[PDB]
RNA sequence: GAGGUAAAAUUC
RNA sequence: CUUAAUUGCGAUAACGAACGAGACCUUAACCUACUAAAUAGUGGUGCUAGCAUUUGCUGGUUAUCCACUUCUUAGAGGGACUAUCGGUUUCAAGCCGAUGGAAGUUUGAGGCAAUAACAGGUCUGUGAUGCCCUUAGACGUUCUGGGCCGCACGCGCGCUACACUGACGGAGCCAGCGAGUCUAACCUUGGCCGAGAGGUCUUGGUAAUCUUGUGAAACUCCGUCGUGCUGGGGAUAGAGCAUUGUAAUUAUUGCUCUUCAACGAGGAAUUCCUAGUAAGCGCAAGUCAUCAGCUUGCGUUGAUUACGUCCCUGCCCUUUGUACACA
């Protein structure tokens, strides 16, 4: 039904490769931290980036 | 209410003003079969002669049938405010006349005769049997009967 | 099929006998079975309800439901 | 026990208030009753044929008490309906103006309705005396 | 002061403001009681927060609901939402939480949108059709 | 049921039977089961309903169509053919009188007849049109338990409309005549005949 | 959307949103002659009306 | 005529020209060790008890 | 005066649209780029924003 | 390692 | 392989980019929190009317007197991200189910929308325009009258119907999107006159204020009607009363009486539509001195039946065939 675009996966790759400290696998600490450390224009695309970093932080401690 | 139980004196289809009356129905539609009067005029006459509208034709006493005809032959004297009649400000004498059973067929012919002998456009359109009230006859009116 | 809007004496005796025999009576019951008019069938329901022969379990303007006396 | 007209239902009050003024006789008819359609959007005169001026008057007298004030033009838009105009579909047509005025002129000489300031007509102290007394008689009959 | 809470229930365009103030247990809708709902069929829909919760449960508070906007069915489903939401409001701030969850689980298995609004809204109409999704007709020749 | 005085007058007929067990106005939502196969989540009964009018969202999901009450689904199928689109308050009143006519003849608990009308008017095997070319041949395939509920409501409201067309009998009168004949099938109604006709054709096409 | 009559019947809409405020200030007339020459803005109407009588 | 019940255990998918016939492998309730694939018409979920008019009939692919 | 705000604000847009084409045709040879209007009491300001203002 | 399948349809 | 998608996961003589999609924007939904409201509402206190009178109940009254912002309005914001969890594909992109939640079909619906192309439409939108014609007994302009509405016939879009789930008469009485007069005559309340149409005397509103709660229709109740081209149907036609306008004859239109036909569910064919959608229903706005039966928006009542397939019509992506390239 829904597939994320490339620009969500581009910015999420830029977040994980350098902000592995100060971020955990919880969404609410991944959502309010992108308000200042990144310049995202809209809220809708901002939650889609933090919704996809949270999806990838779950599968780092697993494998 | 109450069902009548006297005898078999019920009277159906019997004719008044030379045109037949539909029997064994509501008394407000006994007059509506007459060509020239309608449903509104039949309800007004039956409310001025002390006639119960919750009945059929029923008994139809001869003292009651004559009062219905008396109203229809003299409408301008029996409390009708003259905005209710069909033929008003007549071309004959300027009075207010009400048409009857065999009268509305003759007066409609006389209303078409005085327009064909003066060569007016409201009357010449009836000579070919076309529409006179000025509408599009492009698509409609393709039957002739 | 013609329907009688005016009662007869031989037809009035038929109403008082056959109606409490029936399980379900209504407007459409009296027109189809007893061969009376539709306008007359409404008046005959109030005549039997007032005397107490038929019993209303539901009363509505469009549909009239009446049962026998228990 | 305390009772008002809002505790009484919609049509048991109208069928009892119009039945009470039938016995009183104080009606003050203009004279053009029984020949009028009472609207310009209806098709037939009313089927009651003996009386039926109390029936609209019972509806108006309750319509004023439940509101602040109403006029003639408020009773023409509400009591009207869709007109069967013919080959083209319906349209909201206001009711007859002369019927709605003579009801408010007949209820004024009784003392029920009064001329309200700043437009419209409100209920009087005699209207609240009469319409609340027989409203108790509706609920006491059914219990 | 007297205990007075206030809620609302929303259908499409009908809102029902329900002031639940103290008293001896009277329920009135626009001055008229709850036994006078304008449909006779839909009168038992507003009775649904009067039967499942208990017989009375109204030993201290009154119910007063007015309507703004809507239709004839849309206002019936607004006043029954206003009572069920206006009942759990009074059983929160004064009555303890343990007896309110008994009311909440009662309207949970029988959910039927009483303690939850209806987010279904009418779709706007596009050009070409008399309705939202529809189209008039087309002729090939 | 421990009555109590209250400010606004609620009558005795409301507080007595509607506060102890979840029945109708004064009628029954009692222990009536199905005399057919189980039909899991196709019969609404337990949990019952108050009236037939419901603004639920049963048509959004493919699965939640069977969660709709069948008393409401009879009001939904008496709500078609032009002028009767909408006007559900007319449709619930027809079902209200339909349960009254059933309740008279041999006292006939009316929720038993409606459930049995669904299970005894559904065509047990249908035909589909596939293959052949030019002159196609019909193939007899099985039918879901959902469509046996869907075709039972359709064949009991269309035939009750055509039997109430151009005659003195009204809608709620002919509908109750369809349901009583559906309980004991004797080919005296609409849906009992159309169930047998769709199966005697399905025998020659398989 | 089209100037002629040819084509599919596509319609086109437009809108202009008008916002309006009012603030009641019991102020002396000295600050009135200051508040009019200050806070000027294009596309903004400023109206001063007489009192309650 | 006799009646024979069958419970849905596995569903295959849609098979037909117009796409209205579902291949469903039903298992009988009077025999829990024998199954026959049948062609149905309407919406069929798992664990549904169907009514079969003919007990023994192997379903083919419709074309 | 005495114009409703559903018509005065529309007529202010007509006032801007009427001056758009005239200052395009007249100031064509002067590098016209658009104007803005600023209404203030006792002095109405219309800013002529062009590229070359000495010829203007 | 096995798993379906034929009507007619001409010209600018 | 996966999606509405050249969406992505990945695979690789391609590596990095530019468009479209997505993003963005507008609107409809949610916040008992924020800043606030006599041009939006409620509660309380005074005065006052009626009913019960033991404390009540239902209303009225504009700077009496204060408090509040729950609804309504909308500034700044918050909020779903397929979150959490259980299965499934070799992991991975993704799919399916349940719970929670106002909302889990791209949240619903729109706006915008590439490259290349058409001998598509408009010279009758333009003082946008080449060329040609005309330029004064004018194919300039203006006035009077007529026409664009004529008609054996064919087609297209719509309206009303073929009724008793209905007509008709009383009564119940429920909305939203809107729109309205300055150097004038717009929307109209209220009171009288009139059967109606309407007329007259005044008033509010340059507008969340007044019309306006647009107390609209379907609808709901109570009655009449009882199957009969009937009381379903209102076409056609006669007479009269009025409004608009300098002017209405070819009846502008409204109203009242009378006329009261065809039509008994529509052949071969064919159109639209998947949820608050279809359909039924009326209102507002556009054109407007007057007239929609049209159209653009909006609200009210609110289904049945799919959650698929490529059979028909048709569109994308590759593979292949070609004597087609005006394809
Ligand atoms: Mg005679
Ligand atoms: Mg009559
Ligand atoms: Mg001729
Ligand atoms: Mg002709
Ligand atoms: Mg005409
Ligand atoms: Mg008069
Ligand atoms: Mg829910
Ligand atoms: Mg809409
Ligand atoms: Mg078209
Ligand atoms: Mg069917
Ligand atoms: Mg049907
Ligand atoms: Mg009948
Ligand atoms: Mg946005
Ligand atoms: Mg708020
Ligand atoms: Mg494009
Ligand atoms: Mg063109
Ligand atoms: Mg033109
Ligand atoms: Mg042009
Ligand atoms: Mg010359
Ligand atoms: Mg010359
Ligand atoms: Mg010369
Ligand atoms: Mg001249
Ligand atoms: Mg002309
Ligand atoms: Mg009838
Ligand atoms: Mg009616
Ligand atoms: Mg009402
Ligand atoms: Mg003025
Ligand atoms: Mg407002
Ligand atoms: Mg209202
Ligand atoms: Mg109602
Ligand atoms: Mg065609
Ligand atoms: Mg309109
Ligand atoms: Mg118009
Ligand atoms: Mg699909």
Tab-separated table of C-alpha atoms (C1' of nucleotides) in Angstrom, chain K residues 155-306:
chain	number	residue	atom	x	y	z
K	155	C	C1'	-30.788	11.768	-32.355
K	156	G	C1'	-28.437	13.589	-27.441
K	157	C	C1'	-28.557	15.524	-22.332
K	158	G	C1'	-32.457	16.224	-18.409
K	159	C	C1'	-37.463	16.800	-15.847
K	160	U	C1'	-42.260	14.640	-14.170
K	161	A	C1'	-44.688	9.954	-13.916
K	162	C	C1'	-46.791	5.050	-14.546
K	163	A	C1'	-48.956	5.262	-7.018
K	164	C	C1'	-51.574	2.390	-1.460
K	165	U	C1'	-42.909	1.912	0.806
K	166	G	C1'	-48.260	6.166	-2.334
K	167	A	C1'	-51.314	10.800	-3.416
K	168	C	C1'	-54.313	14.278	-0.494
K	169	G	C1'	-55.614	17.360	4.395
K	170	G	C1'	-54.057	19.006	9.061
K	171	A	C1'	-50.106	18.569	12.504
K	172	G	C1'	-44.532	17.301	14.020
K	173	C	C1'	-40.234	21.088	12.482
K	174	C	C1'	-34.420	19.829	11.013
K	175	A	C1'	-29.643	22.254	8.196
K	176	G	C1'	-25.212	23.910	5.743
K	177	C	C1'	-22.409	26.468	1.571
K	178	G	C1'	-23.944	31.393	0.642
K	179	A	C1'	-25.328	36.255	-1.148
K	180	G	C1'	-26.959	41.688	-0.301
K	181	U	C1'	-28.050	49.371	-1.311
K	182	C	C1'	-23.307	56.082	-2.535
K	183	U	C1'	-23.686	59.806	-4.045
K	184	A	C1'	-28.525	55.144	-4.261
K	185	A	C1'	-33.492	52.078	-4.979
K	186	C	C1'	-30.036	45.812	-3.053
K	187	C	C1'	-31.395	41.786	0.428
K	188	U	C1'	-35.999	42.342	3.407
K	189	U	C1'	-37.997	41.717	8.888
K	190	G	C1'	-42.502	43.775	11.325
K	191	G	C1'	-47.835	45.922	11.037
K	192	C	C1'	-52.350	46.356	7.739
K	193	C	C1'	-55.176	44.985	2.665
K	194	G	C1'	-56.036	40.587	-0.585
K	195	A	C1'	-58.417	33.442	-1.963
K	196	G	C1'	-53.755	33.718	-4.200
K	197	A	C1'	-50.256	36.382	-6.978
K	198	G	C1'	-49.200	40.583	-4.586
K	199	G	C1'	-49.904	45.674	-2.780
K	200	U	C1'	-49.022	49.459	1.053
K	201	C	C1'	-46.867	51.949	5.613
K	202	U	C1'	-42.194	51.711	8.205
K	203	U	C1'	-37.668	49.520	10.239
K	204	G	C1'	-32.822	46.633	10.668
K	205	G	C1'	-28.283	45.501	8.019
K	206	U	C1'	-22.316	48.253	3.686
K	207	A	C1'	-23.179	42.681	7.278
K	208	A	C1'	-20.737	36.335	12.994
K	209	U	C1'	-24.919	42.077	14.259
K	210	C	C1'	-30.540	42.641	10.146
K	211	U	C1'	-33.008	39.472	6.448
K	212	U	C1'	-31.261	34.531	9.058
K	213	G	C1'	-32.329	29.815	13.539
K	214	U	C1'	-32.734	31.258	5.685
K	215	G	C1'	-37.977	26.733	12.100
K	216	A	C1'	-36.078	24.175	3.107
K	217	A	C1'	-37.802	19.495	1.183
K	218	A	C1'	-37.717	14.271	1.581
K	219	C	C1'	-39.272	13.123	6.113
K	220	U	C1'	-42.741	12.083	11.192
K	221	C	C1'	-47.798	11.996	13.177
K	222	C	C1'	-53.293	11.914	12.546
K	223	G	C1'	-57.059	11.237	8.995
K	224	U	C1'	-59.387	10.663	4.123
K	225	C	C1'	-58.534	7.458	-0.008
K	226	G	C1'	-59.127	1.196	-1.513
K	227	U	C1'	-57.693	-0.450	-6.814
K	228	G	C1'	-61.268	1.314	-11.215
K	229	C	C1'	-56.185	4.979	-17.761
K	230	U	C1'	-58.711	6.319	-9.907
K	231	G	C1'	-58.118	10.834	-5.654
K	232	G	C1'	-51.607	8.021	-10.046
K	233	G	C1'	-50.251	11.400	-14.174
K	234	G	C1'	-50.732	17.512	-15.268
K	235	A	C1'	-49.566	17.474	-21.055
K	236	U	C1'	-52.946	20.232	-24.045
K	237	A	C1'	-56.739	24.209	-24.247
K	238	G	C1'	-60.425	28.499	-22.613
K	239	A	C1'	-61.505	32.808	-19.263
K	240	G	C1'	-59.767	36.229	-15.493
K	241	C	C1'	-56.747	38.657	-11.593
K	242	A	C1'	-51.321	40.761	-10.903
K	243	U	C1'	-45.835	41.513	-11.081
K	244	U	C1'	-41.084	42.872	-14.290
K	245	G	C1'	-40.106	46.329	-18.223
K	246	U	C1'	-40.489	52.143	-22.895
K	247	A	C1'	-42.408	47.721	-25.069
K	248	A	C1'	-44.355	40.596	-23.145
K	249	U	C1'	-48.748	39.485	-29.562
K	250	U	C1'	-45.234	33.886	-30.542
K	251	A	C1'	-49.542	33.414	-24.261
K	252	U	C1'	-41.821	36.688	-19.936
K	253	U	C1'	-43.367	34.741	-15.337
K	254	G	C1'	-46.573	34.143	-10.864
K	255	C	C1'	-51.657	33.054	-9.232
K	256	U	C1'	-57.237	31.139	-9.475
K	257	C	C1'	-60.961	28.366	-12.065
K	258	U	C1'	-61.764	24.976	-15.977
K	259	U	C1'	-59.583	21.260	-19.860
K	260	C	C1'	-57.424	16.004	-17.029
K	261	A	C1'	-54.513	13.264	-22.950
K	262	A	C1'	-50.205	9.641	-23.492
K	263	C	C1'	-48.180	6.571	-19.880
K	264	G	C1'	-50.132	-0.625	-16.770
K	265	A	C1'	-42.187	-0.769	-15.378
K	266	G	C1'	-40.465	0.062	-21.156
K	267	G	C1'	-37.543	-3.927	-27.418
K	268	A	C1'	-32.435	-4.270	-29.643
K	269	A	C1'	-28.660	-1.546	-27.073
K	270	U	C1'	-26.150	1.664	-23.571
K	271	U	C1'	-24.331	5.175	-19.084
K	272	C	C1'	-22.663	6.185	-14.006
K	273	C	C1'	-21.020	4.315	-9.255
K	274	U	C1'	-17.284	0.881	-3.907
K	275	A	C1'	-18.957	4.415	2.034
K	276	G	C1'	-21.192	8.506	4.833
K	277	U	C1'	-20.046	6.981	-1.864
K	278	A	C1'	-24.931	5.319	-5.123
K	279	A	C1'	-29.840	7.042	-5.081
K	280	G	C1'	-33.934	10.125	-3.163
K	281	C	C1'	-34.525	15.358	-1.434
K	282	G	C1'	-34.498	20.653	-1.257
K	283	C	C1'	-31.555	25.276	-0.611
K	284	A	C1'	-27.796	28.938	-2.072
K	285	A	C1'	-24.808	31.029	-5.907
K	286	G	C1'	-23.610	31.860	-11.369
K	287	U	C1'	-26.099	33.876	-15.771
K	288	C	C1'	-30.683	37.885	-13.844
K	289	A	C1'	-35.091	44.274	-14.907
K	290	U	C1'	-38.281	39.351	-15.246
K	291	C	C1'	-38.031	33.716	-16.129
K	292	A	C1'	-33.918	26.666	-14.906
K	293	G	C1'	-36.810	22.146	-15.759
K	294	C	C1'	-29.497	24.109	-16.436
K	295	U	C1'	-24.864	24.395	-13.969
K	296	U	C1'	-21.339	25.362	-9.858
K	297	G	C1'	-21.333	24.460	-4.434
K	298	C	C1'	-23.770	22.780	0.095
K	299	G	C1'	-26.665	20.096	3.609
K	300	U	C1'	-30.633	16.286	4.994
K	301	U	C1'	-32.201	10.710	4.535
K	302	G	C1'	-28.876	7.021	3.372
K	303	A	C1'	-28.526	1.106	0.659
K	304	U	C1'	-27.614	-3.544	-1.950
K	305	U	C1'	-23.185	-5.715	-3.599
K	306	A	C1'	-16.970	-6.566	-4.968
